[PDB]
Amino acid sequence: KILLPEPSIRSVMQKYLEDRGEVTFEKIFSQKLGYLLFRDFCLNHLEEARPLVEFYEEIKKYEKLETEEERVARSREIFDSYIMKELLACSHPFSKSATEHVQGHLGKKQVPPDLFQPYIEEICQNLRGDVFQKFIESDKFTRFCQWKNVELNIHLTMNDFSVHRIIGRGGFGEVYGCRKADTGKMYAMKCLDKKRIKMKQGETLALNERIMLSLVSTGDCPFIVCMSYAFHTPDKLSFILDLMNGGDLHYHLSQHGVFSEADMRFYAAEIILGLEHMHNRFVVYRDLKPANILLDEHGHVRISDLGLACDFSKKKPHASVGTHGYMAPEVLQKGVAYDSSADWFSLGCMLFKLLRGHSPFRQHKTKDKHEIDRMTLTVELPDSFSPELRSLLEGLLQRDVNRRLGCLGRGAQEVKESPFFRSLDWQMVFLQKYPPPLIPPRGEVNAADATKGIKLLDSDQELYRNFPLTISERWQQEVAETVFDTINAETDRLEARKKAKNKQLGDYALGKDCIMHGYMSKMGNPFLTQWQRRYFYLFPNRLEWRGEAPQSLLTMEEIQSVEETQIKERKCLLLKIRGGKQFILQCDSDPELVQWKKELRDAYREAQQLVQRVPKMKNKP
Amino acid sequence: SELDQLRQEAEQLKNQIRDARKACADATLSQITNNIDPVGRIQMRTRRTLRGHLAKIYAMHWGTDSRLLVSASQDGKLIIWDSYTTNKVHAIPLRSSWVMTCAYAPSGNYVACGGLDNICSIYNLKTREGNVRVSRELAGHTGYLSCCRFLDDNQIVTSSGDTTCALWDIETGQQTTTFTGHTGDVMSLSLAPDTRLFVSGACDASAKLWDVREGMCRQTFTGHESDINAICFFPNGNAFATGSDDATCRLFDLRADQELMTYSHDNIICGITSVSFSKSGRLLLAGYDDFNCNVWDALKADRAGVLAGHDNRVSCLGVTDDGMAVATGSWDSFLKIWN
Amino acid sequence: TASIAQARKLVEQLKMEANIDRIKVSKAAADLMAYCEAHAKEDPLLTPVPASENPFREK
Numbered sequence A: 001k002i003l004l005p006e007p008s009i010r011s012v013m014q015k016y017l018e019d020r021g022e023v024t025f026e027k028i029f030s031q032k033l034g035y036l037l038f039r040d041f042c043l044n045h046l047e048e049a050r051p052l053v054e055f056y057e058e059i060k061k062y063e064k065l066e067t068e069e070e071r072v073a074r075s076r077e078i079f080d081s082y083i084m085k086e087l088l089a090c091s092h093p094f095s096k097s098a099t100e101h102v103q104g105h106l107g108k109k110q111v112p113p114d115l116f117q118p119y120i121e122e123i124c125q126n127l128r129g130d131v132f133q134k135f136i137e138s139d140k141f142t143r144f145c146q147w148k149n150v151e152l153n154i155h156l157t158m159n160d161f162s163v164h165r166i167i168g169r170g171g172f173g174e175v176y177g178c179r180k181a182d183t184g185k186m187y188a189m190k191c192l193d194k195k196r197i198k199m200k201q202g203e204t205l206a207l208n209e210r211i212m213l214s215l216v217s218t219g220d221c222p223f224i225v226c227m228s229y230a231f232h233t234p235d236k237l238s239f240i241l242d243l244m245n246g247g248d249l250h251y252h253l254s255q256h257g258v259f260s261e262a263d264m265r266f267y268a269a270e271i272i273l274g275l276e277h278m279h280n281r282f283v284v285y286r287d288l289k290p291a292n293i294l295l296d297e298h299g300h301v302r303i304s305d306l307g308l309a310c311d312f313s314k315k316k317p318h319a320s321v322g323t324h325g326y327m328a329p330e331v332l333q334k335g336v337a338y339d340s341s342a343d344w345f346s347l348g349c350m351l352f353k354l355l356r357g358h359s360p361f362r363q364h365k366t367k368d369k370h371e372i373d374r375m376t377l378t379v380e381l382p383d384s385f386s387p388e389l390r391s392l393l394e395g396l397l398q399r400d401v402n403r404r405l406g407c408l409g410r411g412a413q414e415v416k417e418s419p420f421f422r423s424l425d426w427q428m429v430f431l432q433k434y435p436p437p438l439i440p441p442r443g444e445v446n447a448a449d450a451t452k453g454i455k456l457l458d459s460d461q462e463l464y465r466n467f468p469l470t471i472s473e474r475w476q477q478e479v480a481e482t483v484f485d486t487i488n489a490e491t492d493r494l495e496a497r498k499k500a501k502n503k504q505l506g507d508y509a510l511g512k513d514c515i516m517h518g519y520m521s522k523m524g525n526p527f528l529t530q531w532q533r534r535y536f537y538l539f540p541n542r543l544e545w546r547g548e549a550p551q552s553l554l555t556m557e558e559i560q561s562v563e564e565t566q567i568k569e570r571k572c573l574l575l576k577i578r579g580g581k582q583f584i585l586q587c588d589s590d591p592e593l594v595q596w597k598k599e600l601r602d603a604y605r606e607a608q609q610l611v612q613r614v615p616k617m618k619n620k621p
Numbered sequence B: 001s002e003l004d005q006l007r008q009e010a011e012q013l014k015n016q017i018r019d020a021r022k023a024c025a026d027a028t029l030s031q032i033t034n035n036i037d038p039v040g041r042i043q044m045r046t047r048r049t050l051r052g053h054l055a056k057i058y059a060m061h062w063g064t065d066s067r068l069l070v071s072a073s074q075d076g077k078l079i080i081w082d083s084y085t086t087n088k089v090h091a092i093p094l095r096s097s098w099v100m101t102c103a104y105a106p107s108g109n110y111v112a113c114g115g116l117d118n119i120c121s122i123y124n125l126k127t128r129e130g131n132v133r134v135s136r137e138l139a140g141h142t143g144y145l146s147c148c149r150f151l152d153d154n155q156i157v158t159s160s161g162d163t164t165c166a167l168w169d170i171e172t173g174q175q176t177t178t179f180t181g182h183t184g185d186v187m188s189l190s191l192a193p194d195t196r197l198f199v200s201g202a203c204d205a206s207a208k209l210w211d212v213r214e215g216m217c218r219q220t221f222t223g224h225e226s227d228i229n230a231i232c233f234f235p236n237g238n239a240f241a242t243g244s245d246d247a248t249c250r251l252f253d254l255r256a257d258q259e260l261m262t263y264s265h266d267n268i269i270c271g272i273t274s275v276s277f278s279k280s281g282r283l284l285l286a287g288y289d290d291f292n293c294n295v296w297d298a299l300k301a302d303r304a305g306v307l308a309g310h311d312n313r314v315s316c317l318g319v320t321d322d323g324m325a326v327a328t329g330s331w332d333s334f335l336k337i338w339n
Numbered sequence C: 001t002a003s004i005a006q007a008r009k010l011v012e013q014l015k016m017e018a019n020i021d022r023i024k025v026s027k028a029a030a031d032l033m034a035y036c037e038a039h040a041k042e043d044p045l046l047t048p049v050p051a052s053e054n055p056f057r058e059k
């Protein structure tokens, strides 16, 4: 389960974030959990900002209205409730350009999904600063510090997941269906064996897949397999990815046979939106083929395996990378620079394979690599294809890059306007509202299928030392949709019994010059595993702790250095004292250790330099 | 040049002052007292050990009742002790950790303290419900507060690292009088018995006599080769002693306007942190950086006794007004009462 | 410093210190000894008092 720290964590947490400029309204409001707490603060704990956030929320609900008949009804309700009636009481704190824009469209009866967009800018300008500072002063920002402490202290192991049946097998590892224990969110675990990576010399692809997954996993794309976490064991590399347990199209292309033009239109539409999302983040996939298109439980598809995808934001690629039968002519030609145009040509080869059962260039059932190459370098479309489909493939399978569809300077939008997709509402494609042509049956049974005697070295593990990663937007969304409300209530009643019991029994930090205060464990006799958990107070000239008022301390002039060491596979703080003595401290989280190390160092440097210039306090021969 | 003539004239006045003093040095205090009997062995034992502070003690001050006792410590606290019972009357957490000095008002109604916060804080000891709250913060110095002494409940005098001293009206917080003249950090001050004059010792190796009600420097005393860390009046207001980093104490007579005696021994090399006279002025007690307090014969300049009961620097001492005991504060967080 | 006013202030200060009435050291030394003699009886640290008048000797 998830355990929130005590509200006393605010002291260390608030300085940790403030050193990183993370206490900005722009930084906390744009986070999923920060918004929920800031909104919970404005609604219930403030009569002044309550209309401002309810106005903000009615706009965000208006933007998600799909049809025009719903937006004509909603835009008038918002205007009559948050514009007109506020202007009637003169308590409408918005500019004249804001009222003239909304009222201008309404009398004109124009209701685009971004009608109230100018108000979004001004609602934030009124929440930022005055209301945002009163929010930091409240318990809601304390709760944000408690949650942010959990997020920043994430260290995933295999035991954090319940691993189930295999949903995919590849050349370097397997993919399992798993469930994250603390929240219950179902995921997939792509588990790569470091050993099988060294033998096949694929360390570049493994590391490249992580940075490529990191570039795309923000924004929640429904058509790419995105990453929530990444971690490694001494033997394995683990990606935590969207659960896609319906197999790939390579397997379904065999069990079902070729697809009709209409059934192909579904997979084509969802892949395009995936390629658009990838191209908007300057990533070329290069490996588009039915084996890399996975299906979920309902039949919707996502692009997966980003190992061969590379960034082209700076230098365009030129190497021959891809699967023979799908690589563009300028891809095979080594030394020829190319960009996202490869995926549009790859789309043509893949869409033809779903229609005719083979790549357009793998003819008369050939297995020869060099033959599929030359038949692509320098276009028989059968009599069965319709003229609109014929136009799409002829546009996507143009060998000249300057004449290929989707390469003419507008990206995927050109492909969306192809007469082959004239019947589709692309917003309905994004919302996954079209019925999939193939609903997979439960039980994998080999639906996503593609020894060794070498040992791992210390040099092999150093390549994987920057592998752990956590996408913050992913974790907060995972939390918000599961336990965020339940944990907030469970930890609210505990902080209430604490005040219900302390008021009858009986703060040491207020009214002085205390820098920071919080919990820490100091080491007594290490042979007894004697760790003593005490609440510490850091002053400019001493460090006090208690368990009962503080009965001992440590002056900043005794401290000679602050060095971070490891004790029994755990990070601890080692203070060397002037009397040849050592002081050992342990925290509950990584950010606490980072902050105590920084502040204790800052305090003994400033204090010792200050004591030096005072004749009464300094040491004399 | 006028600036050159003013420098030339100031040198002649220094020589005129020097020759006038030598015209009075007909005999010495050592010759004068050569006939009186020695004090003998001053054997003082520890009677109380005040345990409470968690770090270095910097300053203490006796109350006029010869029983209550306030001290300032590195732990950012003022403790008001009952020396008869060792019970702590008040433990005052301070708003600033860098406290360096403390004073007990003659009436016992207020205590004061200050340090690197450049502020003298007056604490009220009469509030019934609230337990010892700040009544005034005296701001004005541009350097650290090194010493402060009440004249009564409405006036207090302070010394500062900004090389000045000041007299304050506590009711209004005004710095009514400024005492400029020192060229180094003022380390200590001592009020005269009639509270009409006071002496100050600074890091310029000089002591100065000030007129409280007129704000002028009357006399300047030189002789120490290093900073003067402590100072106190002879019980009759006509002389005073100074402790210095040069490992010596010196006695200065006001009316003869010069040094009378130097208290030093070749064995003693560490500096002096505090000085005080016994009730009759016969004994001069001095605290040292070598963890000891030495009792000096003020008239014959002999070592009368040694107080050795601290494991770190003796930073402050003081004799009760009844002369019944001496308290010593130390860098080992302990105060000890001797008689 | 190059301050003319500061130099005047110092010259005027040294004149205040120069034009004072000083007594011989012999007289100053005798008056101090006469004080110690007159009050050597009232000094508990000098002439030791018994444990009865001592608040710190077993009470």
Ligand SMILES: O=C(NCc1ccccn1)c1cc([C@@H]2CCNC[C@H]2COc2ccc3[nH]ncc3c2)ccc1F
Binding pocket: A167, A168, A169, A170, A171, A172, A173, A174, A175, A188, A190, A191, A192, A202, A205, A206, A209, A225, A241, A242, A243, A244, A245, A248, A291, A292, A293, A294, A304, A305, A307, A448, A449, A450
């Ligand atoms: O080594 C594999 N690639 C080569 C590679 C990958 C990374 C680094 C270097 N070299 C590999 C391949 C596969 C599959 C086999 C068929 N092509 C599709 C691959 C996708 O597999 C799935 C199945 C279900 C899923 N749900 N969520 C995610 C997910 C992923 C599986 C595991 C692999 F390990």
